[PDB]
Ligand binder design. Structure first.
Ligand code: ADP
Lengths: 182, 532, 91
């Protein structure tokens, strides 16, 4: 729980990244989020946007849950030596925070990517070909992509697409059902 | 081949007979002529020898333009060629008088600085005409190469002498008038620093012998009137500032702009458009309307473009056959220029509490400034400053905030607004960067007005640096600020007492109609801003 | 609610941008601005926040939403940098 596999663009055929969340610390005080790793300014901002939406999404889904409001959460992307940037992992951060807050592991062999706004809308991201190739190399079964990237995904070669269950989403509410079927 | 070369040698020798060639120059001619004698016409080096020797013969040596030394005639030329510019005209008249006493031509380094469009470049042409000199203009703003000043090496293929050397041939005299433009806009460069070359040009000791890179011989650059133009003096390099004599040209008020447009701008644009006075008519009201609404600069550069546009459309109208004659009345002005560009002279017609009008000065020209304060929140208060404020400007706000708190204790002890409230201070037009301690006293008034809930006296503009104890310090650009204040239609202007010299150096009509107050401490400003 | 469409200038012509605000937390309120916003745009948010806080006092005095609550402000497409006081009234 608290670990979600993501997709990243790399010159060496792309790669898949992970997002790890953990409790940093065990009445009006509020929690805080710390982001570690060589994250760029755009990537750091996306974590703040994801953190705000994750808090808001929790009130509607589970008002009694106050894990994301009071607790202090540490977010780390492993392999900190390599620099990371881009809003690609915005939706991955939301799932990691939600999984940690709800204490439920995300669906196995599931990878997601795509920029997310603080209202929950999923925005298209570049490097669809690299992300899809890295997903197959990582041996994932389900891949979540923005709905606006449907043309990019279907423009790829036939032999790098079959065998992959791809989900196209517009809002994070659809990602929540896929990530946490229950 | 030799006979053709012989004719080339003979014609070149004839040209140098009139010139008073220096001792070290004639030997250079002789050796080049000797090399030309033994070189064939088809040789590549023959062209270089032929071209270089031509340049040496073309440059005058000891030939001086016939200067005019009549004070009355020169003054009449200056008055008929330009309006105003009394300080510039006084210096030129004094220049002629000194030359008369000396009994021979002499040179000087002069600098004209002010807002663009004032007439710095145009007066240079009038001065040369009055002085019976030759006018030459070149710019150095944003220039990084020093080779342009002195040319390139002779052995280099496709190399030409420098602009000053090129100036000598075209002017055909050793006493020309040289104009340098955008001196304040020069900057440091990696390839080379032309500031060192400019220092030698403007140094009376160094310019006596100037070394180029093509002719490779010293040239007497003295006895040459050097005129340089800039927008501000602060960005001019310090060593260059000392060698230059600073003469200030200020902007024009609305009544001054109409006189320039009626007498100079309109006739010049009409003449270059092929029209006449009878066919094309521009009244005073349309010219007044163009200045008030279609222009905001302190100069007349933008006004000239608007006038030229009107004549261009008028010339097209008569050619197309719409009308034999075109009269530009205010009713049909929109058919020529369109909707007015500027509709409000000032952002705040009536200042609410916490709003005080200020004055700002830039290289562009004078400008008006507003300071707005508001309650950010409904143990210790805080002040937030917005806008593209510089480091100096932000610090002045801190000084003003501290003094404003102290002033309220001695004036309204029961009032704790400035200590127990969070106040946001914003200077509108946040896109434009702002800097300088000029608005120090303006910020104090805005904070005091907001705390007391009393609007400041209408049509009042103030400027001046304020100290921690309340002392008002002098600020620069008083002339530009006063012109902008007059354009904004203010009635009362508060200035530091140490700036009295700058304010009274303005023209009589500019000062007239303005209620100026000179202060040394903010206690006097409080009574003026808040009479009750 | 909390989302307003604005207008922007780009190299490829005009563009339309949205301004979305949300509650950061469920007694001084704070505003956080996200996105690759320039210094001028960041300052315009502070000016807009101050005026909107003051405007509510004269319009709905009983409404204390802006003075106490924590609001997060984000302009979408965070990768693309944005600058200018153009979107002041949209905020
Ligand atoms: N007092 C004046 N009398 C006559 N013409 C003027 C006067 N002031 C300005 N002008 C006109 O306005 C124009 C100003 O342009 P110029 O001075 O060359 O710009 P800059 O100052 O940037 O070099 C000139 O062409 C000049 O004819």
């Amino acid at each position: 729980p608290g670990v979600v596999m993501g997709l990243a663009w790399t010159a060496m055929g792309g790669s898949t990244l992970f997002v790890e969340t953990s409790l940093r610390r065990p009445g009006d005080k509020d929690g805080s989020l710390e982001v570690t790793g060589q994250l760029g300014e755009v990537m750091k901002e996306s974590a703040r946007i994801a953190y705000t939406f994750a808090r808001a999404f929790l009130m509607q889904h589970a008002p009694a849950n106050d894990y994301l409001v009071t607790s202090h959460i540490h977010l780390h992307v492993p392999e900190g030596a390599t620099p990371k940037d881009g809003p690609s992992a915005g939706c991955t951060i939301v799932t990691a925070l939600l999984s940690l807050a709800m204490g439920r592991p995300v669906r196995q062999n599931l990878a997601m990517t795509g920029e997310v706004s603080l209202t929950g809308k999923i925005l298209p991201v570049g490097g669809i070909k690299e992300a899809t190739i890295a997903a197959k190399r990582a041996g994932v079964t389900c891949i979540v992509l923005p709905a606006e990237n449907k043309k990019d995904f279907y423009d790829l070669a036939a032999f790098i697409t079959e065998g992959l269950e791809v989900h196209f989403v517009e809002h994070y509410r659809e990602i929540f059902d896929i990530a946490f079927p229950d | 081949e030799k006979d053709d070369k012989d004719a080339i040698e003979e014609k070149f020798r004839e040209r140098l007979k009139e010139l008073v060639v220096p001792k070290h120059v004639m030997d250079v001619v002789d050796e080049e002529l000797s090399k030309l004698g033994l070189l064939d016409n088809h040789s590549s080096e023959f062209n270089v020898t032929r071209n270089y020797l031509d340049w040496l013969t073309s440059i005058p040596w000891g030939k001086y333009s016939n200067e005019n030394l009549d004070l009355a005639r020169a003054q009449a030329v200056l008055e008929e060629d330009h309006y105003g510019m009394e300080d510039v005209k006084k210096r030129i008249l004094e220049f002629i008088a000194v030359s008369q006493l000396r009994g021979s031509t002499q040179g000087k380094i002069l600098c004209f600085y002010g807002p663009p469009g004032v007439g710095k470049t145009s007066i240079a042409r009038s001065i040369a005409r009055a002085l019976n000199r030759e006018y030459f203009r070149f710019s150095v703003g944003g220039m990084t190469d020093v080779a342009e000043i002195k040319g390139h090496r002779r052995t280099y293929v496709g190399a030409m002498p420098g602009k000053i050397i090129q100036c000598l041939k075209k002017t055909k005299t050793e006493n020309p008038l040289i104009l340098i433009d955008e001196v304040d806009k020069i900057g440091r460069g990696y390839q080379g620093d032309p500031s060192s070359a400019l220092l030698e040009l403007l140094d009376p000791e160094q310019n006596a012998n100037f070394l180029d890179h093509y002719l490779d011989v010293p040239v007497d650059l003295s006895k040459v009137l050097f005129i340089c133009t800039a927008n501000v003096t602060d960005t001019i390099p310090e060593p260059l500032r000392d060698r230059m004599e600073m003469i200030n040209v200020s902007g024009y008020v609305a009544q001054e702009k109409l006189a320039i447009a009626e007498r100079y701008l309109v006739p010049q644009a009409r003449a270059l458009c092929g029209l006449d006075e009878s066919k094309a008519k521009l009244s005073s009201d349309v010219l007044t309307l163009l200045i008030k609404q279609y222009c905001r600069e302190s100069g007349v550069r933008n006004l000239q473009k608007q006038v030229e546009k009107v004549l261009r459309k008028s010339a097209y109208k008569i050619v197309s056959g719409e009308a034999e004659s075109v009269e530009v009345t205010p009713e049909n002005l929109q058919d020529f220029v369109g909707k007015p560009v500027f509709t409000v002279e000032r952002m705040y017609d009536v200042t609410p509490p916490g709003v005080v009008m200020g004055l700002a000065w830039t290289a562009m020209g004078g400008s008006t400034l507003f300071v707005e304060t508001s309650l950010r929140r409904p143990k210790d208060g805080s002040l937030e400053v917005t806008g593209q404020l510089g480091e100096v400007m932000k610090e002045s706000a801190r000084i003003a905030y501290t003094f404003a708190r102290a002033f309220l204790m001695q004036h309204a002890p029961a009032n704790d607004y400035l200590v127990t409230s969070h106040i946001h201070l914003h200077v509108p037009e946040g896109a434009t960067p702002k800097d300088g301690p000029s608005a120090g006293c303006t910020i104090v008034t805005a904070l005091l007005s907001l705390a007391m809930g009393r609007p400041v006296r209408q049509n009042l503009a103030m400027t001046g640096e304020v100290s921690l104890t309340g002392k008002i310090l002098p600020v620069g650009g008083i002339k530009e600020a006063t012109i902008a204040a007059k354009r904004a239609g203010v009635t009362c202007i508060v200035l530091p007492a140490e700036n009295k010299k700058d304010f009274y150096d303005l023209a009589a009509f500019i000062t007239e109609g303005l209620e100026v107050h000179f202060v040394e401490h903010y206690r006097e400003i409080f009574d003026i801003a808040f009479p009750d």
